[PDB]
Ligand binder design. Structure first.
Ligand SMILES: CCCCCCCCCCCCCCCCCC(=O)OC[C@H](CO[C@@H]1O[C@H](CO[C@H]2O[C@H](CO)[C@H](O)[C@H](O)[C@H]2O)[C@H](O)[C@H](O)[C@H]1O)OC(=O)CCCCCCCCCCCCCCCCC
Ligand SMILES: CCCCCCCCCCCCCCCCCC(=O)OC[C@H](CO[C@@H]1O[C@H](CO[C@H]2O[C@H](CO)[C@H](O)[C@H](O)[C@H]2O)[C@H](O)[C@H](O)[C@H]1O)OC(=O)CCCCCCCCCCCCCCCCC
Ligand code: CLA
Ligand code: CLA
Ligand code: CLA
Ligand code: CLA
Ligand SMILES: CCCCCCCCCCCCCCCCCC(=O)OC[C@H](CO[C@@H]1O[C@H](CO)[C@H](O)[C@H](O)[C@H]1O)OC(=O)CCCCCCCCCCCCCCCCC
Ligand SMILES: CCCCCCCCCCCCCCCC(=O)OC[C@H](COP(=O)(O)OC[C@@H](O)CO)OC(=O)CCCCCCCCCCCCCCC
Ligand SMILES: CCCCCCCCCCCCCCCC(=O)OC[C@H](COP(=O)(O)OC[C@@H](O)CO)OC(=O)CCCCCCCCCCCCCCC
Ligand SMILES: CC1=C(/C=C/C(C)=C/C=C/C(C)=C/C=C/C=C(C)/C=C/C=C(C)/C=C/C2=C(C)CCCC2(C)C)C(C)(C)CCC1
Ligand SMILES: CC1=C(/C=C/C(C)=C/C=C/C(C)=C/C=C/C=C(C)/C=C/C=C(C)/C=C/C2=C(C)CCCC2(C)C)C(C)(C)CCC1
Ligand code: OEX
Ligand SMILES: [Cl-]
Lengths: 238, 102, 144, 188, 51, 176, 449, 49
């Protein structure tokens, strides 16, 4: 980060263009009270909610420990401009729900062995609740590829060949029955958010997040891996 | 509709006795008007190994309609010689090719 | 397929993109210049909305030092202001339209100065130019 | 031999309206002059079908179906009539699965139809008509949607229906004129 | 259970004996993850010999 | 009509992937290269047989001495390219030999293609792409292009087959 | 005239017979200038007589009229042609001046002095006299600087020039504060030619154009004065070939570079080449198509921000490789586009979701639709659309014509520069007519390995 | 984007019907190889790039 919302809005597009400052989340000023702060209990409208990751770890199927990864797709992995609702109770319990906005970004990383691991970074339909220092929840992870995506041999779920066009002699291809079927089914993930600062003067919040989800499976043709994503987040309450 | 000699791959369409299309295996399954699932086509075998056996599962019906393009459906042993699955040519073709070049 | 009721989309402006691409229609109809001249109510409403938006939003943006937002606002909805002013002033007698043209030219020079100051990021100069622009816009509106 | 001289130095074009009139069994319409006859019968009761030379997506079809009612209103409300005849836009029967990665589509749906306009009107003779205007979109985005124009009526105990299809890509490039002309000329 | 010597490697143990354990592919002869392999990896040494 | 013939040969036979056609195109392009390079080299190593800037008039067909410097041409092309001709007879025989061999190889390829003996596919690549839905090369893209060409040209190019194809069986990409 | 008997140059190379004839060369140059002015005037008259007001300028195949529109002549707010008389005036003036120039060239080429080195010493010259050539170069540099200043005066005092970025729509503005900052001027000149940077083609406001023209006028005048008062130094005498053909080759290379730059500017620029008079550019059409499809699908009740495409990247909005919010699809390569109708919806970090969800204007939508349908695609017989379309539309973009023609001209003049530089270097050395049989240079060198 | 000659639907009979030509067969082949050049890189109907 290292820039606030006002500082970001004080620039020009030609000054931000190319500097990778559009892939970052704003931080709060010195007026931000620590913890939950002085927020009046109630339900607020969430706006400008963004999450900037700071590390990716991959646990290959068959391993019990996460591993570091190297990003391959440059600065395209920040979710931003999401909108929703935030409710604060008198005790301190808070509930966060995400409705719209850019809440998904495909990401590809490489691991120690040299295997590229695509995954679908998203917090779509986020539903978390808990205290200020911890918010456990879940989200839905849509398929990496759509139903109309066609594989290199022209096989797709809702459009494409249902078999292998090249192997004409093999009438049924019972050996290839596994790869001829495509399913774009969705899955779910888990999240654990936290709140570190809050400014009731302008209705701004910030904290950290840790999420766990699954990598892609090439439309049901692979065993997905588990990926842990951690970083910071920011949002505005109004 | 039987697959002509020219085509390496041919679409699967089903015609009635008047030559009008009635069913096919669609490439774009978002909207379909002659889909086998819609029409409800079934296959029955007369004579041979599968005499008297009727298949109504759409996947099996599609699989058998795919092999009807090649002509008479047969049973092959693709394990003795590890056949890859692409058609070859006969001594007729080899002789003709070699002697034209010569 | 599955039916959806979207009959109210046309009342929301669904045919604007299809009419703008109709090569049979004249260019004035495609660009919307013919409709505004035929119906001056649209021009008057656009002028009033542009004036109100200029006042409130320019004050807010210059106060908080939002230069990009201020310039975009100056050319987002106000983008038809010159054409609307010309159309309104073309329906006036010779002397009245001459005075309106002079006032409009002065106002446009004021807006140009305000945009230059917003680009150069001078808060006090931009505020003074904005006050002058508001005065000139009020004068030209009263002239029409 | 024929003996007919060539039309040298002729300043008149035989046909320039872009439409060719057609006289059928109980109906008449103006078919676009650049469309060729087709041998496909996708819906029950097809008695006429024409498709464009350039793109086969643009086509029209006329259905004459047998019903008991002698009036179109007895088949239900225009909304109910359109709901009953929803097979005219096709069905996603071949796609059997669940998905959540479509652009602006309901879950497990790869196609949708937007009813842009409905209308009920009577001709000069005095026969009621049901006019529809739909835009069906696909998951992949074929041609940016398809425009369907439907005009249905009942005469002598039979239902007469016409559906004119035109891809959006051709629709906004100037081919909407032929489709609208064929749709508006349907007389029974 | 699948060490260097079970795969019939001849020159790789001789490279490893003198202190080369990392590769440009990200892996390490001990099963860990490579940290800045540098010029002197297995591939680097092979390329140096070719040059 | 010849353009349609060429496109048909691409769509149905994969004629671009035939080694005999590759030899033919290599021969044709090499013949053009040889023609241009020989013309330029002869014209830029001439001898000063006149006083006018128009050098076309300093020649006589019945003369004995050659009109250009073979030694200078050989040295130039030896220092520029690495190899050069030192025999005029060998030069001109090579000029004759290249396009004739290219065209003969192309003819043998077309003779082979007459019986649908086309080098159409690589079986290993097809099997790998079938087993692994992530493997893609330019060869598979060319295969898909050929399939599209065949499917969309078959109906009109061959009226005798009476192919009626519903719009939903023709292969097609997303939004295009 | 002359003949091959006393010159040695054939009829197909006959213009080389007047290399050392100053009067005839001057006559030929004056006649050619008259021809250029004649074409300008005649083409302007032809284009002004075939112009209808119901269609935009770029839809009628005009290339000279948009040049006068950008100077603020006969145009109004929004980019609508209002008056036509100034175009007629310009064409008539050009035609009559061409008549005068043609008479002068014919006189100087037919009956004028053949070699003006004895009767007119001021105008006489020798190709090998460096001082005289440098003096002539300085005089013409002063003239060009005066022309640049004349362009500058138009945008300041004589009504101004059309500004497509003016607040409240494009209109003929007056440039009061040109950018004369050395850092700004040097930034355009020494910029990379690749994407994003764009070299000098990326100039995005009229203030920079006017400031650069002030700079170039001052530089040209100062350089002309410098060359009139000086002569080439030793390091310059040691590096160049001093002959008429050599000077011609230098000029040919310079103008080939100029032609390539003009082609690129016509294809890519939007400030000096407003889309109101030239039509949309390449990227502009794709951005407009994505914008209008987003608007239409949003009107049908869809979530554009969260919509996912077949590949899983985003149907309408995706993220640029540096982080900016851009359009989705194949138009992800054109995210460097910046146009007057799209900038108001763009925030500091790219496109603004709320702005394009609640504050999209009908004029913006109309501009997007018009630039989508009039894409710069066509055929040689002027058939609009992609190569797999039908014969329905007779349209080819004015940007395509200028770009293609000027690329062809630039390449051919580069080839001409190569030819003439080689010939000049050979002829000055003295072996342009062939090798000497008596003394062949190669025979005196040691054989290679 | 200054393509070659486009003689598509050029020959038209007296009543307006289109008479095909070798150019139209070439157009059919082009349409075949156009919709399959990039199967998933397009979201909108026009390939303006
Ligand atoms: C000093 C010596 C040179 C030093 C540097 C040499 C580097 C060499 C690197 C190796 C590769 C070769 C060169 C590649 C050039 C690629 C040019 C390019 O991608 O683009 C060219 C650029 C265009 O830049 C574009 O500029 C655009 C301008 O932006 C803005 O433009 C307007 C501004 O108002 C609009 O607002 C618009 O919306 C907005 O985008 C965008 O930025 C684009 O992204 C950007 O690509 O043009 C320009 O730089 C202007 C013209 C440049 C020269 C001519 C190019 C064409 C001819 C090639 C050579 C000759 C070939 C024929 C002879 C062959 C035999 C010898
Ligand atoms: C030496 C040459 C040896 C070969 C000669 C071949 C024949 C050439 C002469 C005949 C050309 C002709 O019949 O030409 C016909 C046309 C005139 O006909 C009219 O041409 C018009 C062209 O469209 C133009 O006008 C339309 C209607 O307004 C639209 O506005 C459209 O956008 C616009 O482009 C329309 O088609 C009209 O219907 C039609 O009547 O000649 C013209 O326009 C002008 C012709 C001269 C142009 C010279 C400059 C060319 C610059 C571009 C070069 C590009 C690079 C090379 C590419 C290869
Ligand atoms: C761009 C135009 C152009 C121009 C301006 C010139 C100019 C010139 N040429 Mg070149 N030339 C050109 C193209 C051009 N040429 C081309 C394309 C070729 C290849 C065919 C040649 C080949 C060539 C040769 C072979 C020779 C020249 C020579 C000459 C020069 C002598 C003139 C003369 O003796 O002719 C006398 C000709 C005539 C009496 C005919 C008169 C017709 C007039 C000039 C027509 C213009 C009139 C116009 C319709 C009305 C204008 C009047 C006004 C009031 C409007 C002259 C400076 C000569 C030279 O080298 O001089 C030393 C010569 O030997 N030229
Ligand atoms: C910019 C101005 C320019 C000028 C002033 C010259 C000047 C000259 N050229 Mg160069 N040249 C130029 C650009 C220029 N060239 C370009 C762009 C090329 C392209 C590569 C050439 C290629 C060239 C060649 C190949 C030759 C010259 C030679 C010459 C001389 C005789 C020309 C002749 O008599 O024309 C007579 C004109 C014609 C026969 C008309 C031909 C029509 C062309 C082929 C196409 C028709 C044009 C159509 C619109 C396309 C003369 C000194 C000649 C030489 O002797 O040098 C000493 C010679 O051999 N020039
Ligand atoms: C100091 C005296 C002097 C002056 C004022 C000029 C001025 C001019 N010469 Mg040069 N010239 C001179 C000495 C001089 N020359 C000498 C001694 C020779 C050797 C004989 C030449 C050889 C020469 C030739 C061969 C040609 C010129 C041309 C021109 C004109 C080029 C500008 C133009 O193209 O407009 C466009 C550029 C502008 C910037 C717009 C004008 C803006 C105004 C001037 C302000 C210009 C009128 C060219 C011409 O145009 O002839 C008619 C031409 O072809 N000159
Ligand atoms: C019309 C075009 C023009 C032409 C053809 C010439 C031609 C010539 N110039 Mg002149 N000159 C011009 C305009 C022109 N000049 C202008 C406008 C100025 C004012 C700056 C000068 C000032 C000038 C000086 C000070 C000198 C010459 C010299 C020379 C000769 C050397 C050739 C050369 O450039 O070396 C080949 C080129 C190079 C080695 C590299 C040059 C490219 C520069 C460094 C690029 C960067 C530009 C520079 C930093 C300027 C600032 C940028 C701008 C934004 C302010 C040659 C006769 C020399 C001489 O003989 O004088 C008698 C010399 O010393 N010229
Ligand atoms: C020529 C003959 C050479 C003969 C062999 C010499 C040694 C080769 C191995 C060295 C090597 O590869 O280093 C390789 C290292 C590379 O150092 C670092 O290595 C890291 C590896 O992960 C980094 O990634 C980089 O590769 C590199 O920065 O070299 C050095 O550090 C610099 C050494 C410079 C030595 C110059 C003289 C060498 C010979 C001196 C005489 C013999 C020894 C002294 C005897 C007399 C004592 C009184
Ligand atoms: C548009 C096309 C414009 C270019 C026309 C063809 C130019 C040469 C094509 C490539 C040749 C490669 C080098 C081949 C080579 O060595 O060329 C050499 C050849 C003969 O040289 P000469 O010295 O005899 O003639 C050139 C001049 O010096 C005449 O005085 O040059 C020509 O004949 C040029 C003809 C121009 C015709 C008018 C234009
Ligand atoms: C810094 C240099 C930059 C350019 C470097 C160019 C390097 C290429 C030089 C190739 C020379 C080979 C000549 C063999 C044969 C040889 O020794 O040539 C030498 C031969 C000798 O001619 P003579 O007149 O002496 O022959 C007398 C007669 O009696 C022969 O029977 O001259 C030629 O035929 C010239 C034609 C060269 C034709 C080149 C063919 C193209 C190369 C193929 C590239 C394949 C690449 C595969 C990569 C996987
Ligand atoms: C020397 C020479 C040459 C050349 C020449 C030349 C290049 C010339 C030019 C010339 C020129 C360049 C001329 C011009 C002229 C012009 C004129 C004579 C004009 C006139 C005009 C008028 C008469 C107008 C009228 C009008 C008006 C006023 C208004 C509107 C209408 C009108 C248009 C009617 C040659 C090649 C043969 C070769 C040999 C030598
Ligand atoms: C107006 C304007 C502007 C401005 C501009 C300017 C100011 C420019 C300048 C320019 C310049 C200032 C240029 C320059 C150039 C140069 C060159 C291009 C050079 C070249 C050289 C050469 C080629 C050389 C060679 C050689 C060598 C190397 C060696 C020895 C020999 C010789 C000498 C030959 C701007 C953009 C702002 C904006 C728009 C408008
Ligand atoms: O990348 Mn290679 O190909 Ca020239 O078009 Mn648009 O982009 Mn894609 O599609 Mn078609
Ligand atoms: Cl796209």
């Amino acid at each position: 980060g290292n820039f606030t919302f006002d500082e970001l809005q004080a620039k020009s597009y030609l000054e931000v263009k190319g500097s990778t400052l559009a892939n970052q989340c704003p931080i709060l000023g010195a007026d931000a009270q620590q913890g939950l702060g002085d927020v009046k209990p109630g339900t607020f409208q969430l706006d400008k909610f963004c999450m900037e990751p700071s590390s990716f770890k991959v646990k290959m199927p068959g391993s019990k420990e996460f591993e570091p990864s190297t990003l391959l797709t440059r600065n395209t992995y920040s979710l931003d401009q999401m909108t929703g609702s935030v409710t604060v109770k008198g005790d301190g319990s808070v509930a966060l729900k995400q409705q719209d906005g850019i809440d998904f970004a495909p990401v590809t990383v490489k691991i120690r062995g040299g295997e590229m691991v695509p995954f679908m970074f998203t917090v779509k339909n986020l539903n978390i609740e808990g205290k200020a220092d911890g918010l456990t929840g879940d989200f839905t992870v849509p398929s990496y590829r759509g139903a109309t995506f066609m594989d290199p041999q022209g096989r797709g779920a809702a459009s494409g060949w249902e078999y292998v066009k090249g192997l004409a002699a093999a009438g049924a291809q019972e050996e290839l029955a596994a790869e001829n079927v495509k399913s774009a089914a969705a899955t779910v993930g888990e999240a654990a958010f936290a709140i570190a600062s809050t400014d009731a003067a302008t209705g701004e919040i910030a904290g950290v997040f840790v999420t766990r989800q699954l990598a892609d499976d090439d439309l049901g043709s692979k065993d997905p891996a588990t990926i842990e994503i951690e970083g910071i987040w920011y949002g505005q309450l109004s | 509709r039987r697959m002509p000699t020219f085509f390496e791959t041919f679409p699967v369409v089903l015609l009635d006795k008047d030559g009008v299309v009635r069913a096919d295996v669609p490439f774009r399954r978002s909207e379909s008007k002659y889909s086998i699932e819609q029409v409800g086509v079934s296959v029955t075998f007369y004579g041979g190994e599968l005499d008297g056996v009727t298949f109504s599962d759409p996947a099996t019906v599609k699989k058998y309609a795919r092999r009807a393009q090649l002509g008479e459906i047969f049973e092959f042993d693709r394990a003795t010689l590890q056949s890859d699955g692409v058609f070859r040519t006969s001594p007729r073709g080899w002789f003709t090719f070699a002697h034209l070049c010569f | 397929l599955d039916l959806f009721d979207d009959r109210k989309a046309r009342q929301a402006g669904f045919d604007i993109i299809y009419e703008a691409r109709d090569l049979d229609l004249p260019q004035g109809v495609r660009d919307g210049l013919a409709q505004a001249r035929e119906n001056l109510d649209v021009a008057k409403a656009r002028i009033k909305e542009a004036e109100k938006r200029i006042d409130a939003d320019l004050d807010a943006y210059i106060a908080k030092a939002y230069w990009t937002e201020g310039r975009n606002e100056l050319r987002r909805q106000v983008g038809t202001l010159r054409f609307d002013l010309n159309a309104v002033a073309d329906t006036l007698p010779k002397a009245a339209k001459k005075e309106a043209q002079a006032a409009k030219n002065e106002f446009l020079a004021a807006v140009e100065a305000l945009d230059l100051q917003l680009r150069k990021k001078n808060g006090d100069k931009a505020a003074a130019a904005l006050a002058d622009t508001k005065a000139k816009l009020d004068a030209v509106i009263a002239k029409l | 031999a024929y003996g007919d001289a060539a039309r040298v130095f002729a300043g008149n074009i035989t046909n320039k309206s872009g439409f060719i009139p057609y006289a059928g069994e109980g109906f008449a319409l103006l078919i676009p002059s650049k469309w060729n006859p087709s041998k496909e019968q996708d819906f029950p009761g097809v008695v006429l079908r024409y498709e464009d030379n350039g793109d086969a997506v643009n086509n029209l079809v006329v259905l004459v179906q047998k019903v008991g009612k002698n009036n179109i209103d007895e088949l239900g409300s225009p909304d109910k009539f359109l709901q009953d005849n929803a097979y005219l836009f096709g069905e996603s029967a071949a796609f059997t699965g669940e998905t959540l990665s479509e652009g602006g589509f309901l879950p497990n749906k790869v196609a949708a139809a937007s009813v842009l306009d409905v209308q009920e009107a009577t001709d000069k003779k005095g026969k009621k008509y049901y006019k529809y205007e739909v835009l069906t979109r696909s998951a992949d985005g074929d041609e940016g949607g398809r425009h369907q124009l439907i005009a249905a009526t009942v005469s002598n105990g039979n239902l007469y229906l016409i559906k004119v299809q035109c891809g959006d890509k051709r629709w906004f490039k100037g081919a909407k004129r032929e489709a609208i002309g064929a749709w508006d000329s349907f007389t029974v | 259970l699948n060490p260097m010597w079970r795969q019939g490697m001849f020159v790789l143990p001789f490279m490893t004996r003198l202190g080369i354990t990392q590769s440009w592919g990200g892996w390490t002869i001990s099963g860990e993850t490579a940290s800045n392999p540098g010029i002197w990896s297995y591939e680097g040494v092979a390329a140096a010999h070719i040059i | 009509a010849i353009f349609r013939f060429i496109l048909f040969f691409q769509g149905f036979h994969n004629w671009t992937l035939n080694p005999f056609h590759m030899m033919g195109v290599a021969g044709v392009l090499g013949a053009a290269l040889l023609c241009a390079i020989h013309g330029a080299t002869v014209e830029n190593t001439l001898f000063e047989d006149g006083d006018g800037a128009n050098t076309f008039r300093a020649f006589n067909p019945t003369q004995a001495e050659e009109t250009y410097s073979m030694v200078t041409a050989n040295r130039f092309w030896s220092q520029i390219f690495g190899v050069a001709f030192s025999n005029k007879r060998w030069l001109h025989f090579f000029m004759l030999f290249v396009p004739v061999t290219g065209l003969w190889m192309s003819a043998i390829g077309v003779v082979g293609l007459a019986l649908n003996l086309r080098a159409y596919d690589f079986v290993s690549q097809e099997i790998r792409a079938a087993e692994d839905p992530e493997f893609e090369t330019f060869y598979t893209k060319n295969i898909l292009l050929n399939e599209g060409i065949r499917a969309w040209m078959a109906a009109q190019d061959q009226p005798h087959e009476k192919l009626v194809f519903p719009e939903e069986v023709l292969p097609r990409g997303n939004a295009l | 005239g002359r003949d091959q008997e006393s010159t040695g140059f054939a009829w197909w190379a006959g213009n080389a017979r007047l290399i050392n004839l100053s009067g005839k060369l001057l006559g030929a140059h004056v006649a050619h200038a008259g021809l250029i002015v004649f074409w300008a005037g005649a083409m302007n008259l032809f284009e002004v007589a075939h112009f209808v007001p119901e269609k935009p300028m770029y839809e009628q195949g005009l290339i000279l009229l948009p040049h006068l529109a950008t100077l603020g002549y006969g145009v109004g707010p929004g980019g609508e042609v209002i008056d036509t008389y100034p175009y007629f005036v310009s064409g008539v003036l050009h035609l009559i001046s061409s008549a005068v120039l043609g008479f002068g060239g014919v006189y100087h080429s037919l009956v004028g002095p053949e070699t003006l080195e004895e009767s007119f010493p001021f105008f006489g010259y020798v190709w090998k006299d460096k001082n005289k050539m440098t003096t002539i170069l300085g005089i013409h540099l002063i003239v060009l600087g005066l022309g640049a200043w004349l362009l500058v005066w138009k945008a300041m005092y004589f009504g101004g020039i059309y500004d497509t970025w003016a607040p409240g729509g494009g209109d003929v503005r007056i440039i009061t504060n040109p950018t004369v900052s050395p850092g700004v001027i040097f930034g355009y000149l020494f910029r990379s030619p690749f994407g994003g940077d764009g070299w000098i083609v990326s100039v995005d406001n009229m203030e920079d154009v006017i400031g650069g023209h002030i700079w170039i006028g001052t530089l040209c005048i100062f350089g002309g004065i410098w060359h009139i008062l000086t002569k080439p130094w030793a390091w310059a005498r040691r590096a160049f070939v001093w002959s008429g053909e050599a000077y011609l080759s230098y000029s040919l290379g310079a103008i080939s570079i100029m032609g390539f730059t003009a082609c690129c500017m016509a294809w890519f620029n939007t400030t000096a080449y407003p889309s109101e008079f030239y039509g949309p550019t390449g990227p502009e059409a794709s951005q407009s198509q994505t914008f209008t499809f987003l608007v239409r699908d949003q009107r049908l009740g869809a979530n554009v921000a969260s919509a996912q495409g077949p590949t899983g990247l985003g149907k309408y909005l995706m993220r640029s490789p540096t982080g900016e919010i851009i359009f989705g699809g194949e138009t992800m390569r054109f995210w460097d586009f910046r146009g007057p109708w799209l900038e108001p919806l763009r925030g500091p970090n790219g496109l603004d979701l709320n702005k394009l969800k609640n504050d999209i204007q009908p004029w913006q939508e109309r501009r997007a639709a018009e630039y989508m349908t009039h894409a710069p695609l066509g055929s040689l017989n002027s058939v609009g659309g992609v190569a797999t379309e039908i014969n329905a539309v007779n349209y080819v973009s004015p940007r395509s014509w200028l770009a293609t023609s000027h690329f062809c001209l630039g390449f051919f003049f580069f080839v001409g520069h190569l030819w003439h530089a080689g010939r000049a270097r050979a002829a000055a050395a003295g072996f342009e007519k062939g090798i000497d049989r008596d003394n062949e240079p190669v025979l005196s060198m040691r054989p290679l390995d | 984007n200054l393509n070659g000659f486009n003689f598509n639907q050029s020959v038209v009979d007296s009543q307006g019907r289109v008479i095909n030509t070798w150019a139209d067969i070439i157009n059919r082949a082009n349409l075949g190889m156009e919709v399959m050049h990039e199967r998933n890189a397009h979201n909108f109907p026009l390939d303006l790039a």
